[PDB]
Amino acid sequence: SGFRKMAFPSGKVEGCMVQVTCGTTTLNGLWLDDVVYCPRHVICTSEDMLNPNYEDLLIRKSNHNFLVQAGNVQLRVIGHSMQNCVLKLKVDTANPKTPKYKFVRIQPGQTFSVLACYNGSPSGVYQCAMRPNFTIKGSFLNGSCGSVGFNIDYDCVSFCYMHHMELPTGVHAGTDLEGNFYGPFVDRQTAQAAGTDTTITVNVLAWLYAAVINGDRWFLNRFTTTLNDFNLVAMKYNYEPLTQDHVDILGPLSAQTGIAVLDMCASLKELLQNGMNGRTILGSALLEDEFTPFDVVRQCSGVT
């Protein structure tokens, strides 16, 4: 029994983290095969950051300008190129600890594990969700850029996030491993803001199901509803629309617990309209939306 926000074991990714220094800037890199991946903004000074021309900034650097440290050992940079907002540093040695991996781009609402790093050294791991406004509510300090996010399925590490910046509201923005930003953000010191966020409806439902599985049932009721009716409620409370795909995805949990998805939506409708009236759900006084349906299944089953 029990339910906890849970991250994937980080071992396979720890073995890929290196330190990358350009001039006076140190941040983290990801070492896979013979390439180290890191944010392209490592090549900027503070004045550069204001309005950088990355291709011209890069033309002036030589391979020996990039100091790459794997633990206590220097790696030798033999090439450098850019793909979108990530810098690719070809090194002379393939990482002997390279796991089986893919680069994948995730959808808002999907979760992943973040391995926060500083000076190439892993410091902590935590679970994040890609918000509907394409930010993440991470925990990062100066030096964390280049930390990565990932999922694992059957050993295969799926890398989905590289950290690039913090927004004025304290939430975080980054790219996939092909250098494409999540959200309408740019790697420069210009005025940027997170848009208004919404609540990930399908994930709240999944967490309500996790709650029922764990014996927390007080919010169940006799009523049911329809998609169109519920989605009118979701819009009112700044919840994402619930689609038919979402009902299908929740399928398993629906039959395992005898609450149909639209049965649960009537519980959530009531929770949105009336509050929790002093009670909690899985120990929370808020409705939690950073557990996917798969997250709930994996934890409420044994997957390793």
Partner whose binding site includes residue 81, from Cl ion, ligand Y1H, Na ion, none (CB under 5 to 8 Å by kind):
none
**Other residues' Cβ atoms within 10 Å of the Cβ of residue 73:** 9
**Polymer length of the chain:** 304
Q: Which residue type does 82 have?
A: M
- Minimum distance between the CB of residue 300 and a second copy, rounded to whole angstroms? 8
Closest distance between Na ion and the C-beta of residue 276, in Å?
16
List 145, 163, 172, 246, catalytic entry: 145
Phi and psi angles of residue 277, each rounded to the nearest 5 degrees, phi first: 50, 55
Is the Cα torsion angle 280, 9, 99, 122 positive or negative in sign? positive
| Cα-based angle 22, 117, 43 (whole degrees, multiple of 5) | 20
Active-site option among 41, 80, 163, 164:
41
Is 85 catalytic? The answer is: no
In degrees, rounded to 5, the angle at the alpha carbon of residue 202 between the alpha carbons of residues 146 and 4 is: 60
110 is a contact residue toward Cl ion (CB under 5 A):
yes
Both tokens assigned to 131: 């918000």
Per CB under 5 A, 107 contacts Cl ion? yes
Distance CA 234, CA 227 (A): 10
Confirm or reject binding of residue 3 to a second copy (CB under 8 A). yes
Radius of gyration of the chain (CA): 22
Give the contact letters, 182-221, x = binds to Na ion (CB under 5 A), - = no: ---------------------------------------x
17 touches ligand Y1H by CB under 6 A? no
d(CA 173, CA 165): 5
Q: Name the residue nearer to a second copy (CB basis): 14 or 263.
A: 14
16, 18, 32, 145: which one contacts ligand Y1H (CB under 6 A)? 145
For 226, phi and psi rounded to 5 degrees? -120, 155
Q: Which is nearer to Na ion, 172 or 246 (CB)?
A: 246
* Contacted by 107, from ligand Y1H, Cl ion, Na ion, none: CB < 5 to 8 Å by type: Cl ion
Would you call 156 a catalytic residue per the annotation? no
Task: Measure the CA angle with vertex 302, ends 281 and 279; round to 5°.
Answer: 5
Task: By CB under 6 A, name the one of 65, 69, 84, 189 that touches ligand Y1H.
Answer: 189
24 binds Cl ion (CB under 5 A): no
* Burial tier of 203 (Cβ tally within 10 Å: 0-12, 13-18, 19+): buried
Burial class (CB in 10 A: 0-12, 13-18, 19+), 259: buried
Dig out the tokens for 302 from the structure: 């044994």
Given Na ion, a second copy, ligand Y1H, none, residue 266, with its beta carbon under 5 to 8 Å by kind, binds: Na ion
Told to check if 44 binds ligand Y1H by CB under 6 A, we report: yes
Taking CB within 5 to 8 Å according to partner kind, which of Na ion, ligand Y1H, a second copy, none is near residue 44?
A: ligand Y1H
Which residue from 29, 177, 187, 254 is in contact with ligand Y1H, where contact means CB under 6 A?
187
For residue 1, the partner it binds in Cl ion, Na ion, a second copy, none, with Cβ less than 5 to 8 A by kind, is: a second copy
- Residues binding Na ion (CB under 5 A): 221, 223, 263, 266
Catalytic residues: 41, 145
